[PDB]
Paper text:
Composed of a diverse array of proteins, the tegument is an amorphous aggregate sandwiched between herpesviruses’ icosahedral capsid and outer envelope. These include in HCMV the CVSC proteins pUL77 [pUL25 in herpes simplex virus 1 (HSV-1)] and pUL48 (HSV-1 pUL36; also called large tegument protein), as well as pUL48’s non–CVSC-binding partner, pUL47 (HSV-1 pUL37; also called inner tegument protein). We resolve atomic structures of portal vertex-associated tegument (PVAT) and identify multiple configurations of PVAT arising from layered reorganization of pUL77, pUL48 (large tegument protein), and pUL47 (inner tegument protein) assemblies. Analyses show that pUL77 seals the last-packaged viral genome end through electrostatic interactions, pUL77 and pUL48 harbor a head–linker–capsid-binding motif conducive to PVAT reconfiguration, and pUL47/48 dimers form 45-nm-long filaments extending from the portal vertex.
The remaining portal vertex reconstruction was generated from NIEP 3D classes containing a population of VC2/NC2-like PVATs that, much to our surprise, were inverted 180° vis-à-vis VC2/NC2 PVAT. NC2-inv portal vertices similarly contain CVSCs with a full complement of pUL77 and pUL48 but otherwise exhibit different PVAT head occupancies and configuration. Most apparently, NC2-inv contains a VC2-like pUL48/77 decamer that is flipped 180° relative to pUL48/77 decamer in VC2. Gaussian-filtered NC2-inv maps further reveal (i) very weak densities identifiable as pUL47 bound to pUL48 in the inverted decamer and (ii) the presence of a weak layer of density nested above the inverted decamer identifiable as a pentamer of pUL47/48 dimers. The second copy of pUL77 head domain is invisible in our NC2-inv reconstruction. Intriguingly, the inverted pUL48/77 decamer in NC2-inv is much higher in resolution than in VC2. However, whereas VC2 decamer lacks extensive contact with its underlying capsid (VC2 decamer is spatially localized only by portal cap binding of the genome terminus and flexible linker–CBDs anchored to the capsid), the inverted nature of NC2-inv’s decamer allows each pUL48-l copy to wedge within a valley-like topology between each asymmetric unit’s P hexon tower and adjacent CVSC helix bundle.
Residue numbers in the entry:
A (entry chain G): 1 to 176, 298 to 592
B (entry chain H): 1 to 49
C (entry chain T): 44 to 156, 162 to 290
D (entry chain K): 246 to 588
E (entry chain K): 1029 to 1370
F (entry chain V): 6 to 116, 121 to 248, 258 to 306
G (entry chain U): 4 to 242, 254 to 306
Write the structure that this text describes.
């Protein structure tokens, strides 16, 4: 309850500058699991207008609209793009209620006088309360605007949901001593409760409309032009396709290098072979596996998972340091005899991500982590599991595996370790799309964590309902 | 930490010793604390400073 | 060891308190004629919002004299600030009856052979059931602001918490209801102004085994009280918190 | 008991001896009641005699050289002059130790009761005189505790049914007699007390039993075992599929002629009741909880742990709750419902 | 009958008479003339006198030994009043409120209470949440801890002294300081139990991560919100850290046993609370050293109880079996000795 | 715990009589050495024409307190009162005492008969007054500090006239102004500006920090705080910051709070229990 | 109750440890219970010091803990003495903080210092007698103020800005020493302290005298000085008769403001334990009067 009232007050206070009006949201077991509600850290929202422009980027177009050109030094814009995307995301005030309840009875049990048209009880196992804002640049609000929602957990994981205004405001705009605002807020209550769905129709969430909300009195105007919504739809189509065009670029690169090398594939992963195995069946299995990978590739394919850490601010400085450390001549004897010990070279082991596809039964695995090391006696690659165990799927004749390196080099592998190698071409897309769709969350300080960065994580806060409420 | 060379050097008194278990058994199980044990003639007691 | 002083009071105040172990509080009358009057802790309950209706009726029936009625009139009639008109003097140990009676109070006492402190059930509370070996006791005056009558609370509690700041840290939890109503009155009424919500005064140290329950009888109207069977006194100041 | 104690380092050759040629080797001390029982039971072997004891404490005093060594080195070597003289003389054997050189030559007679145990003579003492009318506890009145464990609601197999008592007791054929749900013990007095699942209910209902989270945490931390036998137990893959085409895509699943691996629960089912607990059962490492089953599975080509709740009692494996037990429990249900002679 | 069987385990304390033997001149007692200190006041003068006693042991091996020859009382009731799991874990609640209240009704328990802040626990060494009973003719309550067992558990395990968890964990058998071998012995299920060569007679108790492990191992209990003042008979069998610490050479293990491993339970309150300040004597506990629990006379029907009570002396030790009804005999003829002293 | 004090100056019969007539008054000495000179005895060593009354309070807080009862030959005997003991004390302020009250020590604001003068050095004793009178005097002086900056408009002068006279039981005191020649002395100005800046800085910072705390466990207290802040902003308005700037503001607010700690926490020094027409003297228990 | 406390050790003692004990006489050690007889495990701060639970938690525990002086220590008998209020005692300082005459002393968990040793003194295998710091009022209240400012600022800020902010804030110099806060962590304890601070600041913003908001600006129109230049510079980042005046209203408003300030003040103030009047010219010990 208190989050909605406080958010109304806070948006009323700042509407002079930001011109955002508040929208109160309550979410249940349909959007997030009970574990995710029990362990939620931050809730974030971002507004995108009908032109596809985020609130926090220059109106006339920005340099992020320019493409990125695959180089790790200027890694998708460096730290400045990260700072811009940090600036565009805004944080809301939220509460977690872990015990089962129904909103009608809970609000009646509170001081708020609900006045809905019919007394249909809506039950939920747990409630997370939040209020998000959507910006009208002037007194006019547009129905083609879309609002993004993000839930952030202490592990840095997050999930993205986006919905447009005309679903949020389908009917709301058509319905048009001293007193403390809390008193009249409780005595005026709420009467209309609607369900909103994400554009992909994947998340259901509820919106509450308090009659004493300050945004009522501004007599603001609302409209939804058809061409405006068509623009919103095509911009959304442009946003959603990033991973799929990246996968198609990988496909076309694979086919191009397979054509270039005349089909002769040299070994790159160490595995014993036999001259009297039928390799024609292996080639046809490679064809079928490649087709299946083209079909079942998802947003969590290895190429996107490897692109994601490249966008973090540490990448650019790390790329500079690594290139400077490689850009060295033979060391002079003076530095060897005197001074500091030599800079540590790149390690003999690496962390990789891979996609494995099976032909015997329809099955692929996408977010697979693998560790790569070079076999000294032959100079070829050896794939080890995260615990150190050897990966045997190389021997398995029904399996083809695609590997991607941290420096965006990818190996395609059929049985026997004979491989197809090429580089990922992120040239195809603007910096804005890569930087907006995927980027690691960067933590901002809150309760229960050390102010000194890099210290060991204390116990996870874990506001919970299985225990007696803590105070 | 107990000065073993002093015990080796300084004059001791004779007693009819009586350990319930075997002497080496009690030494291995360490029925006592801080046991010096060596085989043969270990010349450490000679160097006095 | 103990330090004592002799005090004079009218007979009406003594009628309920005759058993020695009662607290003695000196109230500051607004009028200059009875400028200082020595009221007992029991007299605070009849204007305390944490007492029961039965005990309140008993106290109303006990006090009859014009001095006691005037003391009640002064306690109610002032501008709701109680602790600004009160100073405590410790615990009493003498019996000297008379029309103008004499009673002696220990401002600092540890009596060597029974000296006890008498607190009523309605006024008594404890944060922790885990009785520590040594307990300090405190007097808290509570100020609600819900209505123009400004209903006050008068508490005496024993606790093992030694540091005052942590004691306030834990007291602000239950008395958080004070803070909310205080802010509510601050917004709702722009004209009248408050000072604080609660005040903490420390007087004493005693062992948990000294905390007994006992009965009191004068005017035959029975009262149930808590008895600190070997309490020693050490007067502190009135210390404010919100 | 007297033989178990070893001889002391030192010997004061004259102390604690008895008239008519007896040497005391030990003394027993116990509460007065135990001593009285020993007196009465072992009457012939006890004797009341007069023994010689030192009259005064043996005084040990420091030499000035010892004082200077204590000041300078915080240490004391008693009988320091003896060590000095024996080092200068070159004799490695001392006459006596520093402790045994005190307390002799001052014997006095006192009368006490003694017994003979083999070749030994031992004194007996009862310290009632010290602690009587005193408020301090006698250290010989110690407390020792024991731990008792007993089962309730156990099931003997029906196929191995046997009785050693039929001439002693007979029971009505009511199923409640056949399937036990109670146990009977004795109180601190010799009286019968009854324990039930109903008394246990105050423990059974608490959430900690129904929370498998710590169990799953420790089960995940250990990880899958590396033993080759465990590798066949590990390989189970569970995959969700959309239900849109499930009505007609049935032959496609069977169209490929490849085997389907077993699962941990199904492998757990196929053990005999007594064979279930033996070391040959490889599935025991997953049986951490009655109400919740555990298993290892493959997810994202990585091995992960899984915890699901056993919703109904039927999910209990055959070795933990057999079919005959279920049928007898159904008979008990019928007895409660007055349905043992069913329609 | 629910689909599981229960195993109870409880601790009973006796007040005993000990017999001790010592040899001539075992210990040399050193004494000084007393030192006197004074506190001076106007009311009275008080003198404190102090004699410093020092004991030097002149026995090479063991020169003193004890036997517990006689007993006459049980300080506990030897009852079956089940331990209150709600009191030891007052923090935990069922997620839905009404089901939690209904469970509070079903059990004889009360609303949940918050375990105090660290400062309260430092000023006050404990909570002591369970109040005293209305009356006590039977003495201190014996709280029975219940470890869940499968219904088909071999009854012969209960007829002899054994470890209630289902796997022996006596560190006198393992070689000292071999922590890997000790952990394999006490927790590994790929090798036979050292006492009975089955892998385990209770898979719900004998291996790490089990329900009884998290219930009664203090390592897991500290993770939960639990009260440390309440004594637990299972703790001596489940505290892995203490068991591993007790894995030592023979004589150091013996010293740990008779000096430092002993228990201490309060004697003033009617429920078994652990002591702190030593005003209560340390309690000897052979069950810690042997890491085994003893069987007690237990019967599923009153018929066998009648036929065993009606018989002559020594009939309590025998164990009888029926078509499913059973009785386990007491290993120690205690239930007749306690009459005998009376 | 006794201290002897010797005069460098030359005493005389009537001088000694005036010295001894304060038989059991309290004198503050800077630090407790066994032997001290007469210059250290009293507040005369601290006062000047530029400072103002506030400093004498803060310096009295850290200056050791001491009771005097004797006149020996060329030296004076002093006794340091200890906690928990009871002592005989004199009434030196313009107030009359009553049993059970608490006492505070204040710089003297009104006065001749106390003046033991030797070489233009004067034995200026502090004031012993009950705590309510001390609070009232300090509050009225601090308020009169505010009214000095305007001081021109007629109603302000009427208010200043009203503050100057304070009435207590059976007495009325003519409290002097804290400003001379229309200038406000330096510690008075410093404390007044520190208090005003504390209030002003809190007014600005409260909104940002109530928002930052609201992202934690939002509660009724923060909602009411936000409502009061909007109310304050609405009433006042009708008349992304760098971390180091924000930290500078916060540290400045906290240090400005620290400079004002001396006057807010009026410390108790004695508690009285004796009623007397002999009112000159009273017996007290010591606190400190 | 007890004027004497007897602490005894389970371990056998070496003469080196006995010498250290007899050197540590007159030092301060904390006790959790204020009891007759305690084991040596519950003596000192090694019991409570889990560095994961930061400085605020240990400060909160220590300010509730009671204090005692050291005494007639001998072989396996410590005999600590609890000081009573008002008497004159000899106390030996153990931290590097310089003590000067007239300062009031406060108890705080030890901070870091330059020689980086931390001196793992008195290690009885595992137990290690960690002893608190006794600090004069300015430095100790500086620790408290800097911790509260740390908590108030750090919320909703990225680790990069916070890195420089803590690198400047964590380091304190007092009498030309160099200390730094061991562990700044945002616990519920500091969060409740900040709740109190925010409420107090809101109240002082609300009920303050109307003229005290503008007194600074009137003085700025009146005066121009370095102090006032800085005062204006603070307020500049957000940048005649009063129509009415009533002394009673101002009196009541300033009384309320003083109540609010005293509420906010003691979030930083520490209850003084000792006041010094003596110093050894080697700063190794001082004579003090105890406050309770």
């Amino acid at each position: 309850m208190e989050t909605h009232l406080y958010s109304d007050l806070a948006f009323e206070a700042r509407f002079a500058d930001d011109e955002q009006l508040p929208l109160h949201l309550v979410l249940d077991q349909e959007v997030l699991s009970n574990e995710e509600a029990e362990t939620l850290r931050y809730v974030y929202y971002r507004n995108v207008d009908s032109a596809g422009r985020s609130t926090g980027r220059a109106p006339g177009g920005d340099e992020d609209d320019a493409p990125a050109s695959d180089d790790a030094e200027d890694a998708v814009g460096g730290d400045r793009a990260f700072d811009r995307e940090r600036r565009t995301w805004q944080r809301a005030c939220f509460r977690v209620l872990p015990r089962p309840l129904e909103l009608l009875d809970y609000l009646r049990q509170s001081g708020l006088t609900v006045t809905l048209e019919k007394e249909q009880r809506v039950r939920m196992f747990y409630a997370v309360f939040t209020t998000l804002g959507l910006r009208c640049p002037d007194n006019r609000l547009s129905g083609a605007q879309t609002l993004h929602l993000r839930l952030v957990w202490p592990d840095g994981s997050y999930r993205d949901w986006e919905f447009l205004a005309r679903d949020l405001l389908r009917e709301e705009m058509e319905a048009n001593d001293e007193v403390a605002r809390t008193d009249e807020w409780k005595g005026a209550g709420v009467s209309r409760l609607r369900e909103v769905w994400d554009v992909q129709h994947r998340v259901r969430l509820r919106v509450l409309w308090y009659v004493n909300s300050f945004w009522r009195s501004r007599e603001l105007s609302y409209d939804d032009h058809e061409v405006e919504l068509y623009r919103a739809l095509d911009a959304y189509r442009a946003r959603i396709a990033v991973e799929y065009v990246l996968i198609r670029a990988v496909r076309d690169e694979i086919y191009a290098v397979l054509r270039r090398d005349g089909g002769a594939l040299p070994q790159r992963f160490a595995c014993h072979v036999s001259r009297n195995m039928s390799w024609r069946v292996v080639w046809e299995l490679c064809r079928h596996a490649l087709a299946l990978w083209m079909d079942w590739a998802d947003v969590r394919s290895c190429i996107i998972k490897a692109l994601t850490p490249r966008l973090s601010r540490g990448a650019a400085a790390a790329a500079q340091r690594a290139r400077r450390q490689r850009e060295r001549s033979a060391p002079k004897p003076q530095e060897l005899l005197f001074g500091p010990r030599n800079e540590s070279g790149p390690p003999a082991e690496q962390t990789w991500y891979a996609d494995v596809v099976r032909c015997v039964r329809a099955q692929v695995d996408l977010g697979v982590e693998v560790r790569a090391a070079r076999c000294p006696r032959t100079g070829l690659w050896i794939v080890r599991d995260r615990r150190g165990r050897l990966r045997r799927w190389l021997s398995q004749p029904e399996v083809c595996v695609l590997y991607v390196t941290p420096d965006l080099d990818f190996y395609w592998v059929l049985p026997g370790g004979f491989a197809v190698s090429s580089r990922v071409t992120l040239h195809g897309l603007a910096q804005r799309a890569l930087r907006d769709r995927f980027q690691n969350f960067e933590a901002v300080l809150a309760r229960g964590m050390h102010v000194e960065a890099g210290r060991q994580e204390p116990e996870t806060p874990r506001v919970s309902g299985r225990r007696l409420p803590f105070d | 930490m107990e000065n073993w060379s002093a015990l080796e050097l300084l004059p001791k008194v004779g007693i009819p010793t009586d350990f319930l278990t075997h002497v080496k058994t009690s030494a291995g199980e360490e029925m006592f604390e801080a046991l010096r044990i060596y085989y043969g003639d270990d010349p450490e007691r000679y160097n006095i400073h | 060891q103990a330090l004592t002083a002799r005090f004079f009071v009218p007979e009406g105040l003594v009628e309920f308190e005759a058993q020695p172990g009662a607290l003695l509080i000196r109230m500051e009358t607004g009028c200059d004629s009875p400028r200082h009057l020595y009221i007992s802790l029991y007299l605070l309950g009849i204007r305390a919002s944490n007492v029961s209706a039965s005990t309140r009726c008993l106290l109303e029936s006990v006090y009859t004299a014009s001095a006691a009625r005037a003391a009640l009139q002064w306690l109610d009639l002032g501008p709701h600030l109680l602790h600004r008109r009160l100073e405590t003097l410790g615990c009493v140990k003498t019996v000297s009856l008379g029309i103008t009676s004499l009673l002696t109070c220990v401002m600092r006492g540890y009596l060597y052979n029974v000296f006890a402190l008498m607190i009523p059930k309605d006024m008594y509370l404890t944060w922790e059931e885990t009785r520590g070996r040594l307990q300090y006791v405190y007097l808290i005056i509570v100020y609600d602001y819900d209505g123009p009558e400004t209903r006050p609370g008068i508490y005496v509690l024993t606790s093992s918490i030694a540091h005052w700041q942590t004691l306030v840290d834990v007291a602000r939890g239950k008395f958080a209801r004070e803070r909310c109503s205080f802010v509510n009155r601050r917004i709702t009424r722009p004209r009248q102004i408050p000072l604080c919500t609660g005040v903490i005064q420390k007087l004493g140290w005693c062992l948990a085994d000294d905390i007994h329950t006992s009965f009191l009888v004068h005017k035959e109207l029975k009262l149930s009280v808590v008895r600190l069977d070997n309490f020693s006194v050490e007067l502190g100041d009135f210390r404010e918190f919100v | 008991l007297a033989e178990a104690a070893t001889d002391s380092i030192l010997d004061n050759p004259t102390t604690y001896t008895t008239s008519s040629g007896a040497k005391i080797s030990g003394v027993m001390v116990s509460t007065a009641n135990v001593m009285q029982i020993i007196m009465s039971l072992l009457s012939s072997h006890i004797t009341k005699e007069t023994v010689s004891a030192p009259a005064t404490y043996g005084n040990f005093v420091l030499s000035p050289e010892n004082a200077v060594t204590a000041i300078s080195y915080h240490s004391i070597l008693a009988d320091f002059n003896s060590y000095k003289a024996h080092l200068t003389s070159g004799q490695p054997h001392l006459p006596n130790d520093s402790l045994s050189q005190a307390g002799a030559h001052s014997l006095t007679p006192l009368s006490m009761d003694v017994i003979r145990l083999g070749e030994k003579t031992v004194i007996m003492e009862n310290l009632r005189r010290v602690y009587k009318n005193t408020d301090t506890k006698d250290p010989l009145e110690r407390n020792v505790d024991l731990t008792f464990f007993f089962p309730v609601g156990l099931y003997l197999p029906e196929d191995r049914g046997y009785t050693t008592v039929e001439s002693k007791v007979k029971l009505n054929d009511t199923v409640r007699n056949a399937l036990p749900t109670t146990a009977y013990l004795l109180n601190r007095d010799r009286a019968v007390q009854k324990i039930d699942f109903v008394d246990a209910l105050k423990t059974l209902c608490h959430p900690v039993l129904h929370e498998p989270a710590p169990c799953l945490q420790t089960f995940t931390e250990r990880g899958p075992p590396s033993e080759p036998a465990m590798q066949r137990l590990l390989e189970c893959r569970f995959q969700q599929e959309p239900m849109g085409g499930a009505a007609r895509r049935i032959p496609h699943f069977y169209r490929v002629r490849r085997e389907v691996p077993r699962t941990v629960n199904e492998m757990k089912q196929d053990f005999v009741v007594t064979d279930f607990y033996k070391v040959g059962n490889i599935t025991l490492y997953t049986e951490l909880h009655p109400f919740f089953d555990f298993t290892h599975c493959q997810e994202n080509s990585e091995t992960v742990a899984l915890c699901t709740p056993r919703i109904v009692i039927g999910n209990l494996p055959d070795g933990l709750a057999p079919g005959p037990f279920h049928e007898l429990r159904t008979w008990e249900i019928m007895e409660h419902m007055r349905l043992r002679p069913p329609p | 009958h629910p689909g599981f069987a229960l195993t109870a385990v409880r601790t009973d304390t006796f007040e005993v008479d000990m017999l001790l033997y010592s040899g001539k001149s075992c210990t040399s007692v050193i004494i000084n003339n007393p030192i006197v200190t004074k506190e001076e006041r106007d009311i009275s003068t008080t003198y404190h006198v102090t004699q410093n006693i020092n004991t030097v042991d002149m026995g090479l091996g063991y020169t003193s030994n004890t036997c517990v020859a006689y007993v006459n009382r049980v300080r506990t009731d030897m009852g079956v009043r089940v331990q209150d799991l709600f009191r030891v874990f007052p923090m935990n609640v069922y997620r839905h409120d009404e089901v939690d209240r209904w469970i509070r009704h079903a059990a004889g328990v009360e609303r949940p209470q918050l375990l105090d802040t660290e400062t309260i626990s430092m000023l006050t060494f404990g909570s002591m949440s369970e109040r005293n009973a209305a009356a006590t003719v039977h003495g201190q309550k014996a709280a029975c801890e219940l470890i869940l067992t499968p219904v088909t558990m071999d009854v012969n395990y209960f007829k002899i002294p054994n470890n209630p968890r289902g796997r022996a964990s006596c560190m006198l058998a393992v070689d000292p300081y071999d922590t890997e071998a000790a952990t394999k012995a006490i927790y590994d299920h790929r090798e036979a139990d050292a006492q009975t060569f089955a892998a385990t007679h209770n898979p719900w108790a004998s291996q790490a991560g089990c329900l009884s492990d998290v219930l009664y191992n203090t390592r897991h209990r500290e993770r939960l919100g639990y009260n440390s003042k309440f004594y637990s008979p299972c703790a001596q069998y489940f505290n892995t850290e203490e068991i591993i610490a007790a894995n030592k050479t023979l004589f150091k293990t013996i010293d740990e046993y008779l000096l430092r491993a002993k228990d201490c339970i309060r004697g003033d309150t009617d429920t078994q609370y652990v002591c702190v300040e030593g005003t209560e004597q340390l309690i000897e506990n052979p069950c810690r050293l042997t890491q085994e629990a003893l069987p007690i006379l237990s019967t599923t029907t009153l018929a066998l109880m009648e036929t065993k009570l009606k018989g002559g002396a020594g009939a309590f030790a025998t164990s009888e079996t029926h078509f499913g009804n059973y009785v386990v005999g007491e290993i120690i003829p205690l239930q007749q000795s306690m009459l005998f002293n009376s | 715990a006794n201290i002897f004090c010797t005069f460098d100056h030359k005493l005389s019969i009537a001088d000694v009589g005036k010295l001894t007539k304060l038989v059991a008054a309290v004198v503050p000495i800077p630090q407790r050495l066994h032997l001290i000179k007469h210059y250290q005895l009293g507040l005369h060593q601290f006062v000047d024409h530029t400072r103002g009354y506030v400093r004498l309070r803060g310096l009295l807080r850290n200056m050791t307190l001491t009771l005097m009862r004797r006149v020996e030959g060329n030296q004076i005997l002093l006794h340091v009162p200890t906690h928990g003991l009871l002592y005989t004390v004199l009434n030196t302020g313009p107030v009359t005492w009553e049993k059970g009250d608490a006492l505070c020590v204040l710089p003297p604001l009104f006065h001749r008969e106390n003046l033991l003068t030797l070489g233009q050095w004067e034995l200026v004793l502090p004031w012993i007054v009950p705590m309510p009178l001390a609070l009232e005097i300090n509050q009225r002086l601090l308020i009169m500090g505010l009214f000095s900056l305007d001081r021109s408009y007629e109603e302000v002068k009427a208010a200043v006239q009203q503050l100057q006279t304070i009435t207590f039981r059976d007495a009325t005191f003519t409290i002097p102004d804290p400003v001379i020649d229309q200038h406000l002395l330096i510690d008075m100005k410093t404390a007044c500006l520190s208090m005003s800046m504390v209030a002003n800085l809190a007014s600005e910072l409260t909104m940002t920090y109530v928002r930052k705390l609201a992202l934690e466990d939002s509660s009724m207290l923060l909602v009411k705080c936000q409502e009061l802040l909007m109310r304050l902003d609405r009433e006042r308005s009708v008349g992304h910051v760098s971390p180091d700037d924000e930290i500078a503001r916060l540290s400045a607010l906290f240090v400005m709070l620290r400079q004002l700690d001396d006057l807010i926490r009026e410390q108790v020094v004695f508690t009285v229990c004796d009623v007397s027409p002999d009112n000159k003297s009273a017996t007290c228990i010591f606190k400190g």
